[PDB]
Design a protein around this motif. Sequence first.
Motif, short mmCIF file in Angstrom:
data_model
loop_
_atom_site.label_atom_id
_atom_site.label_comp_id
_atom_site.label_asym_id
_atom_site.label_seq_id
_atom_site.Cartn_x
_atom_site.Cartn_y
_atom_site.Cartn_z
N UNK A 142 0.82 -1.20 0.00
CA UNK A 142 0.00 0.00 0.00
C UNK A 142 0.86 1.26 0.00
N UNK A 143 1.69 1.40 1.03
CA UNK A 143 2.57 2.56 1.15
C UNK A 143 4.03 2.14 1.06
N UNK A 144 4.89 3.08 0.68
CA UNK A 144 6.32 2.81 0.56
C UNK A 144 7.14 3.94 1.17
N UNK A 145 7.76 3.66 2.32
CA UNK A 145 8.57 4.66 3.00
C UNK A 145 10.05 4.50 2.63
N UNK A 146 10.90 5.29 3.28
CA UNK A 146 12.33 5.24 3.02
C UNK A 146 13.05 4.43 4.08
N UNK A 147 12.52 4.46 5.30
CA UNK A 147 13.11 3.72 6.41
C UNK A 147 12.78 2.23 6.32
N UNK A 148 13.18 1.62 5.21
CA UNK A 148 12.92 0.20 5.01
C UNK A 148 11.58 -0.22 5.58
N UNK A 149 10.56 0.61 5.39
CA UNK A 149 9.23 0.32 5.89
C UNK A 149 8.20 0.38 4.76
N UNK A 150 7.65 -0.78 4.41
CA UNK A 150 6.65 -0.86 3.35
C UNK A 150 5.32 -1.38 3.88
N UNK A 151 4.35 -0.48 4.01
CA UNK A 151 3.03 -0.85 4.51
C UNK A 151 2.34 -1.82 3.56
N UNK A 152 2.10 -3.03 4.04
CA UNK A 152 1.44 -4.05 3.23
C UNK A 152 0.17 -4.55 3.91
N UNK A 153 -0.59 -5.38 3.19
CA UNK A 153 -1.83 -5.93 3.73
C UNK A 153 -1.84 -7.45 3.61
N UNK A 154 -1.98 -8.13 4.75
CA UNK A 154 -2.00 -9.58 4.78
C UNK A 154 -2.97 -10.09 5.85
N UNK A 155 -3.63 -11.21 5.56
CA UNK A 155 -4.58 -11.80 6.49
C UNK A 155 -5.64 -10.78 6.90
N UNK A 156 -6.01 -9.91 5.97
CA UNK A 156 -7.02 -8.90 6.26
C UNK A 156 -6.58 -7.94 7.35
N UNK A 157 -5.29 -7.62 7.37
CA UNK A 157 -4.75 -6.71 8.37
C UNK A 157 -3.60 -5.89 7.79
N UNK A 158 -3.59 -4.59 8.09
CA UNK A 158 -2.54 -3.70 7.59
C UNK A 158 -1.52 -3.41 8.69
N UNK A 159 -0.25 -3.65 8.38
CA UNK A 159 0.81 -3.41 9.34
C UNK A 159 2.11 -2.98 8.69
N UNK A 160 3.13 -2.74 9.50
CA UNK A 160 4.43 -2.31 8.99
C UNK A 160 5.36 -3.51 8.83
N UNK A 161 5.92 -3.65 7.63
CA UNK A 161 6.83 -4.75 7.34
C UNK A 161 8.08 -4.25 6.63
N UNK A 162 9.23 -4.89 6.92
CA UNK A 162 10.51 -4.53 6.31
C UNK A 162 10.57 -4.88 4.83
N UNK A 163 10.81 -3.88 3.99
CA UNK A 163 10.90 -4.09 2.55
C UNK A 163 11.91 -5.18 2.22
N UNK A 164 12.86 -5.40 3.12
CA UNK A 164 13.89 -6.41 2.91
C UNK A 164 13.26 -7.80 2.75
N UNK A 165 12.22 -8.06 3.53
CA UNK A 165 11.53 -9.35 3.47
C UNK A 165 10.41 -9.32 2.44
N UNK A 166 10.58 -8.50 1.41
CA UNK A 166 9.58 -8.38 0.35
C UNK A 166 10.24 -8.17 -1.00
N UNK A 167 9.56 -8.60 -2.06
CA UNK A 167 10.08 -8.45 -3.42
C UNK A 167 8.94 -8.39 -4.43
N UNK A 168 9.13 -7.58 -5.47
CA UNK A 168 8.12 -7.43 -6.51
C UNK A 168 7.89 -8.75 -7.24
N UNK A 169 6.63 -9.18 -7.28
CA UNK A 169 6.26 -10.43 -7.94
C UNK A 169 6.19 -10.24 -9.46
#
Length: 71
Positions: free
Chosen positions: A36-63
């Motif tokens: 959803x959102x993309x910050x600079x502090x390695x923080x990429x707001x994503x949505x999973x299990x019907x819940x929005x939280x803060x997750x490290x972009x490091x543990x994420x990659x463009x599909x």
Amino acid sequence: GSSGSSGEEKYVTVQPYTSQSKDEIGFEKGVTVEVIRKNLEGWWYIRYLGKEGWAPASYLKKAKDSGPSSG
């Protein structure tokens, strides 16, 4: 239920992440997430299990979806 599966940029997790607090969301490795959102502090707001939280972009990659779609 959800009946959504809609977003802007769908990413995928390559490693499991354990959330310490609500603010952060914990997921598993090999699942689909919605960026959803993309910050600079390695923080990429994503949505999973019907819940929005803060997750490290490091543990994420463009599909990369395969399809005949042209451009």
